[PDB]
Every structure is written in structure tokens, then in C-alpha cells.
Amino acid sequence: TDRVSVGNLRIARVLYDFVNNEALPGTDIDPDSFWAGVDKVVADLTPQNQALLNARDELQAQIDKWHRRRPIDMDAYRQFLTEIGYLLPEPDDFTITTSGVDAEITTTAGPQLVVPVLNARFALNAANARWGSLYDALYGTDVIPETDGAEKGPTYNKVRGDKVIAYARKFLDDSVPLSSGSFGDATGFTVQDGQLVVALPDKSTGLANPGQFAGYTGAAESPTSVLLINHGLHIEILIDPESQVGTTDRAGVKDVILESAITTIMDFEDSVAAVDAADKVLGYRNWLGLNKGDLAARVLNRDRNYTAPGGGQFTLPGRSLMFVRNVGHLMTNDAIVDTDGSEVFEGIMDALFTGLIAIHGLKASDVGPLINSRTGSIYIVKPKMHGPAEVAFTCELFSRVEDVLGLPQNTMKIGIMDEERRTTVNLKACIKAAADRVVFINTGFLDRTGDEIHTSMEAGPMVRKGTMKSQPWILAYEDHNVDAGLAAGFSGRAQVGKGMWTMTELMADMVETKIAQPRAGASTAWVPSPTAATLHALHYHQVDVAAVQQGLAGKRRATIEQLLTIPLAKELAWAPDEIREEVDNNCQSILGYVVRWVDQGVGASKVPDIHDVALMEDRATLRISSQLLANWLRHGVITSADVRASLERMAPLVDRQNAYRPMAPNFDDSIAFLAAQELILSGAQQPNGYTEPILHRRRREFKARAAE
Ligand SMILES: O=C(O)/C(O)=C/C(=O)c1ccc2[nH]ccc2c1
Numbered sequence: 168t169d170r171v172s173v174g175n176l177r178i179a180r181v182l183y184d185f186v187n188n189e190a191l192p193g194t195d196i197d198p199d200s201f202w203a204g205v206d207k208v209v210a211d212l213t214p215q216n217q218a219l220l221n222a223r224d225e226l227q228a229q230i231d232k233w234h235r236r237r238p239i240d241m242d243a244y245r246q247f248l249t250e251i252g253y254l255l256p257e258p259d260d261f262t263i264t265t266s267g268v269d270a271e272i273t274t275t276a277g278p279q280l281v282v283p284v285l286n287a288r289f290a291l292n293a294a295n296a297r298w299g300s301l302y303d304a305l306y307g308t309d310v311i312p313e314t315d316g317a318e319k320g321p322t323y324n325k326v327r328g329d330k331v332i333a334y335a336r337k338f339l340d341d342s343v344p345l346s347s348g349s350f351g352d353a354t355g356f357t358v359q360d361g362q363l364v365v366a367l368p369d370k371s372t373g374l375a376n377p378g379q380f381a382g383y384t385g386a387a388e389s390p391t392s393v394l395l396i397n398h399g400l401h402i403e404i405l406i407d408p409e410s411q412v413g414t415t416d417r418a419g420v421k422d423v424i425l426e427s428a429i430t431t432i433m434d435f436e437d438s439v440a441a442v443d444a445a446d447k448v449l450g451y452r453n454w455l456g457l458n459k460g461d462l463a464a465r466v467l468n469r470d471r472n473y474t475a476p477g478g479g480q481f482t483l484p485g486r487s488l489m490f491v492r493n494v495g496h497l498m499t500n501d502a503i504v505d506t507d508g509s510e511v512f513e514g515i516m517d518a519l520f521t522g523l524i525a526i527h528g529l530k531a532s533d534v535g536p537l538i539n540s541r542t543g544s545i546y547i548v549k550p551k552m553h554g555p556a557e558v559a560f561t562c563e564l565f566s567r568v569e570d571v572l573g574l575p576q577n578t579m580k581i582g583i584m585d586e587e588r589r590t591t592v593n594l595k596a597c598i599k600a601a602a603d604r605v606v607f608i609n610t611g612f613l614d615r616t617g618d619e620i621h622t623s624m625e626a627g628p629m630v631r632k633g634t635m636k637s638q639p640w641i642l643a644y645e646d647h648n649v650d651a652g653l654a655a656g657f658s659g660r661a662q663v664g665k666g667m668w669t670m671t672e673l674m675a676d677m678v679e680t681k682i683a684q685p686r687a688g689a690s691t692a693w694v695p696s697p698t699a700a701t702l703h704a705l706h707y708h709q710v711d712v713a714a715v716q717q718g719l720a721g722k723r724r725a726t727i728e729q730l731l732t733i734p735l736a737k738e739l740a741w742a743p744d745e746i747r748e749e750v751d752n753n754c755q756s757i758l759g760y761v762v763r764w765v766d767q768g769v770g771a772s773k774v775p776d777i778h779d780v781a782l783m784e785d786r787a788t789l790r791i792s793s794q795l796l797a798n799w800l801r802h803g804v805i806t807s808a809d810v811r812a813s814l815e816r817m818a819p820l821v822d823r824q825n826a827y828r829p830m831a832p833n834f835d836d837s838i839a840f841l842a843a844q845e846l847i848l849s850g851a852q853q854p855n856g857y858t859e860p861i862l863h864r865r866r867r868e869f870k871a872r873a874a875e
């Protein structure tokens with residue numbers, strides 16, 4: 168049909184054509200030595216991949232047994248885990264040796280953006296979100312309360328605009344402070360002899376710390392803009408009295424631009440639905456556009472030029488340093504199949520194909536104008552790993568792709584996600600396994616909750632979904648992550664990252680609460696939009712991360728006993744109503760996500776919950792919900808009759824909460840509905856509670872039954 172024959176591999180034509188005509192040219196790599204390398208690498212590495220997945224299952228079953236066979240004694244649970252190799256011994260202290268890393272990762276602290284790579288429009292904006300308007304972000308979201316007078320209507324509201332402006336002025340004061348006065352009384356900006364002087368109504372002043380003055384545009388007397396700096400992040404004041412917002416401003420300021428999303432993660436994993444070669448080629452084509460510099464729908468902003476505080480003409484990068492998030496070790500994709508017809512490990516494929524593609528990010532001009540890494544590294548996030556032997560295996564896999572691609576060893580750097588229990592209680596061993604390729608560690612708290620629930624499925628009922636964020640195990644897990652990174656010398660070398668803020672409409676809540684992440688010494692945290700990146704940039708001007716990290720070293724705040732504390736609910740924990748509610752809540756979350764996945768191949772979007780509070784979540788949330796319900800089922804809390812009633816109930820609301828095809832009132836005809844049912848009912852049987860097998864299968868079912 169459409170398969171090409173390369174050795175033991177039968178590649179899909181769409182993939183074979185794309186790689187040949189689009190990816191390879193300019194890579195200075197013979198289009199034949201490559202595919203041989205694909206064939207070799209697949210053949211040689213497929214064993215160990217399959218052996219590691221078997222290890223997971225073997226381990227999972229011993230744990231299922233120990234709980235079935237009955238209290239809960241911590242010291243016993245701990246000895247058992249050690250006995251089974253689950254809980255490996257902790258290595259001697261060390262320091263990572265990664266090099267060739269850009270400043271956005273080794274040094275800068277600031278928000279990290281995650282965008283689905285199959286959406287070029289999102290992917291463009293995310294790349295362009297290195298710089299963002301603070302007026303926009305304040306005006307458009309509820310950071311400035313829509314009280315009275317300040318309501319946000321079809322036209323621009325001057326009262327609301329004044330409210331934004333005051334917010335930004337107060338921000339300026341608390342970031343680049345004046346030696347005397349306050350930006351809110353300022354009337355003009357000039358640069359005179361390399362210093363910056365702010366025209367106050369009664370006098371003039373400079374910055375308290377004059378070094379925070381980074382540059383400017385336009386003539387030094389009537390500057391177009393003035394560039395500030397705090398905590399290694401740039402602030403830009405756009406000056407134009409001629410403008411709309413300009414005339415109303417006491418110093419004629421049009422805007423304040425913040426350096427926001429310092430890095431972005433282009434995603435092939437949980438934020439996309441890609442079940443075939445057709446799907447993977449789209450994301451591949453976009454990642455290529457991104458690496459060349461020519462992705463268009465609206466284009467990638469080019470770099471920003473400035474005048475240094477004297478006369479020199481420097482430049483700043485206009486884009487976010489891009490990572491790519493490959494899929495993990497579990498799934499296979501039929502984009503490539505062997506002679507017997509077995510599907511090829513998608514993880515190995517992603518390494519070969521995202522690595523190849525990223526070579527363009529390394530070179531400018533002719534067959535792309537734009538450069539990702541200034542230092543010659545390729546940044547890859549590797550999710551869903553369980554233990555140091557799976558980290559090691561990812562090293563080796565990268566070592567081999569490099570050989571195939573002809574890059575120096577250690578080019579491809581790894582972004583380690585701490586989002587599986589077996590990784591968590593062995594994190595030091597995971598970092599040691601990747602000591603010379605590791606550019607971050609990051610707490611993937613949602614997936615981590617999923618694994619947490621599935622690992623102890625046979626122990627008893629779990630606490631509700633909302634109760635998880637406050638649990639002893641997850642607070643220990645968050646801190647433990649930071650101690651290990653800092654111990655291994657991440658400060659000034661690698662990022663130390665935290666999770667995603669899914670409540671996309673609740674920005675005031677984000678601005679008030681997300682500050683805790685850098686306060687815990689994390690040099691980066693995840694946001695789901697360019698706007699939330701700008702707002703989360705504020706926290707880094709408020710919190711000196713370098714120092715928090717500095718005064719956290721040497722400390723150990725988690726014990727293994729705290730990590731291993733299973734989030735079990737106590738006896739008589741819940742009234743009948745709180746259960747019905749939690750059931751309805753998970754069924755609506757599962758329904759509204761799965762329906763967009765199977766029917767439209769959307770892996771991440773703005774989906775309203777039960778109360779229409781819009782949440783932008785991905786498969787990790789689904790993994791939590793479906794595993795939670797599955798767990799309550801397994802342990803008596805609810806029945807099978809209950810699940811169906813809830814699904815049946817929530818379905819028509821999801822339909823009304825949404826091109827779209829309604830699941831109600833015809834339930835066993837919607838493949839999506841049958842998927843959401845399967846996810847819950849087959850939940851305990853899924854390997855590690857993983858949601859992709861069912862999802863992939865059911866999406867492919869939808870694709871087929873729609874061709875005619
Ligand atoms: O915690 C995890 O397991 C994790 O890796 C997070 C995510 O991947 C994630 C979550 C929600 C999102 N909304 C938009 C994008 C997005 C991404």
C-alpha cells in the first residue's frame with residue numbers, strides 16, 4: 168500500500184517522503200546511511216526497551232500482591248520495596264557535568280511554556296512569547312478585578328486601563344526601584360551619559376541600582392523605549408505619547424513589555440493526539456518549521472536590537488529557547504512496522520526524527536534563517552520514566568542517534584521529568600544516570616499522582632482528587648526534587664522545575680499563588696499560555712531564585728517515609744453526597760477530554776469543568792481521574808451501575824458545553840463515550856494506569872469508521 172522497505176523495517180510512505188524531501192536536505196547526511204541507522208538502532212535497542220517495560224509490570228504485580236495480602240506498616244513496606252529492587256540504594260554525592268548549554272537554562276530563571284506541536288498557531292505564539300505585553304495580560308484577565316467601572320466591554324475602558332497602568336507602575340517600583348520617588352509620578356525618560364534619568368514633577372532621579380539599566384531604542388533624548396533588567400529578566404518600557412494609551416499616561420508610556428517565556432516545550436506527548444504516521448508527520452513538519460525559522464500561518468519574530476547604555480548596538484533573542492518533548496518508553500506507533508507487522512517503539516522513533524530535525528536549529532541560512540541553541544545543544548524532554556535504568560537507557564539511545572546523525576556525543580540534552588514514583592524515590596540515581604546530558608529535573612505532579620494512585624491501587628480507597636495537592640506524599644515529593652537538583656549542582660547549570668497551572672481563567676489566583684514555586688527554589692515553572700507566562704514573569708521579579716537556592720543547599724527536607732506515605736482515605740471518610748459529586752466530577756472531566764481526543768484528535772484545549780471553570784489540562788489529568796474512579800470501584804466506594812449513571816448524566820452537558828458530534832442520547836454508538844467508559848472500567852488493568860493504549864486504539868477506530 169504505502170510502506171517503504173528499509174531493512175527489517177516497513178516505513179509509512181508519508182513518513183518516508185517527509186523525512187527524505189523535508190528533514191534530510193541541509194543536514195549533510197546521506198539519506199541512506201540514515202535509514203540504515205534507523206533500522207540498526209531500532210533492531211539493536213528494541214530488546215532493552217521491551218525488557219524495561221517487563222520490569223515495570225513484574226514490580227507492579229509484587230506490590231499488588233503484598234497489599235492484597237494485607238494496618239499498613241511503614242518499616243515493612245520500606246524493607247519490601249528494597250528487597251524487590253524497587254528501592255535502590257542512594258549513590259555518593261556528585262555534581263553534573265553537562266556543557267554546551269544556553270544561558271536560558273543554566274542561568275536565567277523564569278516561566279516555561281508548554282504547547283502542543285501539532286498546532287502551528289499555538290506553536291508560533293509560544294515561540295514568540297519570549298516577550299509579552301504586561302498591559303494586555305493585566306487588562307485581559309481578572310488580575311485587575313472587573314468590579315464596577317472596571318468592567319471589560321466591547322471597547323477600551325479608561326478606568327480599567329488606569330487600573331492596569333497603576334499595577335504596572337507599582338511593579339516597576341518594586342523591581343527597578345528609584346533612588347528617590349516612584350515611577351507612578353514620572354513624567355519623562357531620557358538617557359544622558361549612559362545613566363538613565365527619570366523626570367519627576369519636582370526634580371530628577373536615577374535608578375537606585377543604575378546597573379539595572381540595560382539599554383534603549385531611539386534618540387537618547389526622546390527614546391522610543393527604555394530597557395530595564397531585574398533578576399536576569401528584561402523589562403521594556405515602550406514610550407509613545409502619540410499613542411492611544413500614550414496620551415493618557417503621565418510619561419506617555421504605551422506599554423510595559425516583560426521577558427516572559429524564557430523557554431518553551433514543543434510537545435509530542437500528553438498535549439497532542441497523534442495515533443498514526445499522518446499525525447506524527449504534521450507535528451514533525453511543525454517542529455521542522457520551528458527549527459528552520461520559517462513556520463508560518465503570522466511568523467516567528469526576529470531578534471530585538473538595542474543601544475547599550477553608551478552607544479554600542481547589542482541584540483536580544485526574540486524567541487523562546489525551544490525544547491521538544493518526545494514520548495516515553497511505553498507506546499508503539501504503526502508509522503513503522505517490522506516484517507512480522509509489529510509496531511515500532513514510538514520513543515525510539517521520536518529520538519531519531521526530532522534529533523534529525525533539530526540539526527536545522529543549529530545552522531542559519533539556506534535550506535533556515537533562525538537558530539535555536541546558540542551553544543550547539545539539542546534539548547529534549549523525556550517523560551514517563553521509572554528508575555535509573557530507564558534513564559541510562561535513554562542516554563544510550565541518544566548516544567546512538569547522535570552516531571547516526573553525526574553529531575558530537577552529548578549534543579542531545581535530556582530534560583528529566585520526575586513524574587513516576589520509581590523515579591522519585593531514586594531521583595539521585597536518575598540524575599547520576601544522566602549526569603552529562605541533564606538540563607533539567609521537573610515535577611510532573613499530575614502524572615505523578617496517577618502513578619501514586621496506580622502503584623497502590625490494591626491498598627485501599629484513595630483520597631479525592633482535590634485532596635491530593637495537600638497530601639504528605641506530594642509535598643515531600645516537591646521538596647525532594649529540589650534537594651536532589653541542588654545537591655547535584657543544578658544552580659548555575661541546569662533547570663529545577665515545577666508543574667502546570669491549569670486554571671486558565673483564574674489568573675489573579677495564579678498571580679497570588681504560583682509565587683510559591685520559585686519560593687521553593689525552582690528556577691522554572693510551567694504555564695499553558697503566552698499570557699500566563701507574562702503574569703508568571705512577575706513572580707521572578709518578586710523572588711530572587713538564585714538566593715533561595717543558595718540558602719537551601721545542604722538541606723534535606725524529605726524522608727523516604729514521607730515519600731512513601733500512601734494517600735489513603737480514612738474510615739467513614741465521605742458522606743453519600745460528596746461521593747456523588749466526586750464521581751460526577753471525574754466523569755465530566757473524563758468525558759469532556761476524551762470526546763475531543765477521539766473525535767477531533769485534540770490533546771489539549773480549554774475545557775470547562777462541572778461549573779464551567781475552564782481548565783486547560785492533558786492526558787495526565789485523565790490518568791488521574793480514570794485511575795481514581797477505577798480505584799473507588801475496586802474498593803467498594805461506588806458501583807458499576809453508579810459509573811454508568813454518572814457518565815450517562817454528564818454526557819449531554821458536555822455536549823451542550825461544546826464540527827462536534829453529540830454522545831447523547833446514543834451512548835454505545837459514540838466511540839468516545841465507549842472510550843471514556845473503558846478508561847474507567849478497564850482502569851486497573853492498564854499498565855501503570857497509562858491512558859494511551861485505550862485512547863490510541865479508540866482514536867484510530869474513529870479515524871477508520873469515517874473514511875467512506
Ligand atoms: O504533570 C504532568 O504530568 C505534566 O507533564 C504536565 C503537562 O504535561 C501539562 C499539563 C497541562 C497542560 N495544559 C496545557 C498544556 C499542559 C501540559
Ligand SMILES: [Mg+2]
Binds near residue numbers: 787
Ligand atoms: Mg506528564
